[PDB]
RNA sequence: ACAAUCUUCUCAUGAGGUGUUGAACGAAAAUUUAAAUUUAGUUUGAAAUCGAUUGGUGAAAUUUUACCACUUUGU
């Protein structure tokens, strides 16, 4: 349709907004946040805004945040919090409890094996896809990834980013399950 | 209430007519929660559905369990009538879908509350799977009291609720969900002290 | 979507805090190295009829930065 000129100036502003922010969080403010109580994160896509800087599109492509909602089993550590402060105004960020994960795995689990969504629901197909990673089941992709087992990053590549289609712009902990829960 | 009332006669014809709405209730308790659906309505089938399973496993009612291709078929006799429901397996798979859900979801707590009532437990129960409904008082015998264990492979605690159901004591792996060992694959490593590795055909077929 | 993250302080006792519409008028000083910054000041409607500085830096796939600024642009 037209657009009207108050949208091109409302990007620019946002733009310059996200700027901002993106400037002083990153430089002279390298501090994290370092989130904990895991070694796995399920964090998901709120809404990114169109016109993204473009430090920032990668950031969601990396983390496997591309398209909206994505929820990934991310290694909690300090080297994703500051990719994830980078993109955290369209993020957020929460723990995956065993039954969350287990019933995203359960019913909406749709692992992206060969980038494609895979249905988890034959735990054949976690153990052949994972018998080398140790993940025998969709159970035992909840040890593997709720409760981040060894091959964690393995079975996150063999997970998929589950879009937990419903969100505050940074922390849940427990609220991604909350999410989960209504997702699936 | 009404609506209730005029259709089922007695409890024994709800008894009788029971059976879609207990299978449509189990179905939809790991169906996906999509637009379609509500989280509320989804919530209240499984709460609906842990309780028939409490209720069944308390008066052990339960006659016979088949491990069939669709699903888990448990059949039980209430007060002489027999019901048959059937359990989908958890695996990663409408207005009037959703209004027979309703009425399905109705008529399970109308006969949850009067089992409830007829066995003196408490209607609603208080809110693990059916470990956090708790029973509160206001074969039969398929494994009477051998303390079986299941590992993170077997149906754990769809076989210690099946199990419980007619007169067993299945366990359960912590994240899945001794005297028995109930694993997916036969495992004879994994089973532990006193557990013997349990097939779930052996299970099934002694409780049937 | 004329909506969005420009700072309730922070640490440490000191240090910081990253941030300013445009235009017009105007001192008189300094260093830095004439432009470059500071630099008494100012005036006005979020005012508006050329005048552009004109290099660098990356950072993607050479045109693209309409702030990317040397600490110099896709994790």
Redesign the interface.
């Given at each position: 349709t037209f657009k009207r000129a108050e949208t091109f100036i409302n990007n620019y502003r946002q733009r310059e907004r996200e700027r901002i922010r993106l400037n002083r969080s990153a430089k002279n403010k390298g501090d994290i946040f370092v989130p904990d109580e895991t070694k796995l994160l399920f964090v998901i896509r709120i809404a990114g805004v169109k016109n993204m800087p473009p430090k920032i599109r990668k950031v969601l492509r990396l983390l496997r945040l591309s398209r909206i909602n994505n929820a990934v089993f991310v290694r909690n550590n300090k080297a994703v919090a500051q990719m994830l402060r980078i993109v955290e105004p369209y993020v957020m960020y929460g723990i995956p409890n065993?039954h969350s994960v287990?019933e995203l795995?359960?019913?909406?689990?749709?692992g992206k094996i060969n980038g494609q969504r895979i249905?988890?629901?034959?735990?054949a197909l976690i153990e052949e896809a994972l018998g080398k990673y140790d993940v025998?089941?969709?159970?035992?992709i909840?040890?593997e990834i709720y409760?981040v087992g060894s091959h964690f990053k393995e079975v996150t590549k063999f997970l998929w980013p589950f879009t937990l289609t419903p969100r505050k712009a940074g922390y849940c902990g427990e609220e991604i399950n909350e999410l989960i829960?209504?997702?699936? | 209430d009404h609506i209730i009332k005029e259709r089922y006669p007695t409890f024994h014809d709800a008894l009788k007519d029971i059976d879609d709405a207990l299978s449509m209730l189990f179905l939809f308790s790991?169906?996906?929660?999509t637009d379609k659906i509500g989280?509320a309505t989804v919530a209240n089938c499984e709460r609906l559905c842990a309780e028939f399973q409490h209720y069944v496993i308390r008066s052990n009612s339960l006659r016979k369990a088949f491990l069939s291709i669709k699903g888990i078929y448990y059949q039980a006799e209430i007060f002489g009538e027999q019901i048959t429901w059937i359990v989908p397996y958890?695996?990663?798979?409408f207005r009037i879908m959703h209004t027979f859900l309703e009425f399905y979801q109705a008529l399970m707590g109308f006969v949850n509350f009067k089992l409830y009532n007829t066995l003196g437990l408490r209607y609603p129960p208080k809110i693990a799977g059916l470990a956090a409904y708790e029973l509160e008082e206001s074969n039969t015998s398929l494994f009477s009291n051998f303390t079986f264990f299941l590992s993170?492979?077997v149906p754990?605690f769809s076989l210690e609720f099946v199990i419980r159901a007619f007169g067993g004591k299945v366990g359960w792996?912590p994240?899945?969900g001794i005297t028995h060992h109930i694993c997916?694959r036969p495992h004879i490593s994994q089973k532990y002290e006193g557990r013997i590795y349990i097939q779930p055909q052996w299970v099934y077929d002694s409780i049937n």
């Open positions: 065993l287990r795995i359960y019913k909406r689990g749709f249905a988890l629901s034959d735990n025998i089941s969709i159970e035992d909840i040890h409760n829960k209504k997702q699936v | 790991t169906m996906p929660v989280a958890k695996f990663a798979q993170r492979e754990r792996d994240i899945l997916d």
